[PDB]
Each structure stands twice: as structure tokens, then as C-alpha cells.
């Protein structure tokens, strides 16, 4: 079996938080496996970031209603050109 | 006599009866992770890939 490995041949982007569910199912039985539900729920979000979409999607949806401006130190996009220039 | 062998008789259907339902039952029993996937790698926790292993990749 290949799960698990990276394409580069380490450990893929989701393998800790399938790690830790796997720890859980394998510390449970079938009774108590519910108990397991909050690992397996973090393993889906690394898989789809749906949570975090959500968060943004609240996030931008706020920021788009406001005409008030923003006082904190910002992002700044550059050219790969001006990557350590200045 | 008659009672008798009547009753040995109804006694051994009974046992079967009894044996039926034992064997339903501990066929719906779950059995273990060695028994029912592997007994000699037993540990069901993966590795993953070994060549750039990443110090804090591990998670319990």
C-alpha cells in the first residue's frame, strides 16, 4: 500500500491528523468508536479546507461591507522580479 | 420408557436450539484486530513514507 506517502516519498499534506483518528480507532471499539469523531472531523478539514472556505466566506462577506478603512500591518504583493529588492 | 425416550429426545432438540442461538450470537461478536485483519502486523497505526521525515510530523 502507497497511503500515506507523499509525492515527493514522505509523508502527505493530511498524514498527522489520519495519524492521530488512526491512534483513536485503534485505542476504541466499535461502541466507543464515536468517540474517535472529532480526529476523523479534523482529518476531513485538512482534506477540504470546507471550514475554513466557511470562515473566509464570513470573513470577505464582512470586509466587502465596510466603508471603514483598515489599521494594521498589511499584505503587499510583489513582482517574483522584486523578490529582496529595496 | 416411552416418556423417557420422548423426553431424551426433546432434550437433544433443545441443545440444538440452544447451540443455533449460541452461534448466532458469537458470529455477531467483533472480534479483534489481529484476528480479523492481521496477527502479525497488528498495529493498525500507519507510518507513512521514511525519506524526508519530518521531525513533528508524528501525532498521537
Given at each position: ?15 498527522s491528523?489520519?495519524?492521530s483518528?488512526?491512534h483513536?480507532?485503534?485505542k476504541?471499539?466499535?461502541k466507543?468508536?464515536?468517540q474517535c469523531l472529532?480526529?476523523f ?5 485538512c482534506?477540504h ?24 500591518p498589511?499584505?503587499k504583493?510583489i ?8 | 420408557?416411552?416418556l ?5 429426545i ?19 461478536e467483533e ?15 500507519p ?6 521525515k ?7
Amino acid at each position: 500500500t502507497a497511503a500515506g506517502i507523499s509525492l515527493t516519498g514522505g509523508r502527505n499534506r493530511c498524514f498527522s491528523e489520519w495519524q492521530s483518528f488512526m491512534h483513536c480507532t485503534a485505542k476504541t471499539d466499535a461502541k466507543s468508536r464515536a468517540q474517535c469523531l472529532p480526529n476523523f472531523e479534523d482529518y476531513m478539514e485538512c482534506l477540504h479546507h470546507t471550514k475554513e472556505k466557511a470562515r473566509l466566506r464570513e470573513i470577505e462577506s464582512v470586509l466587502k461591507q465596510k466603508k471603514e478603512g483598515l489599521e494594521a500591518p498589511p499584505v503587499k504583493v510583489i513582482p517574483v522580479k522584486a523578490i529582496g529588492l529595496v | 420408557d416411552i416418556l423417557n425416550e420422548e423426553a431424551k429426545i426433546v432434550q437433544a432438540l433443545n441443545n440444538q436450539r440452544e447451540l443455533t442461538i449460541k452461534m448466532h450470537e458469537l458470529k455477531r461478536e467483533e472480534k479483534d484486530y489481529a484476528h480479523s485483519y492481521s496477527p502479525l502486523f497488528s498495529d493498525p497505526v500507519p507510518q507513512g513514507g521514511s525519506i524526508g521525515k519530518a521531525p513533528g510530523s508524528s501525532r498521537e
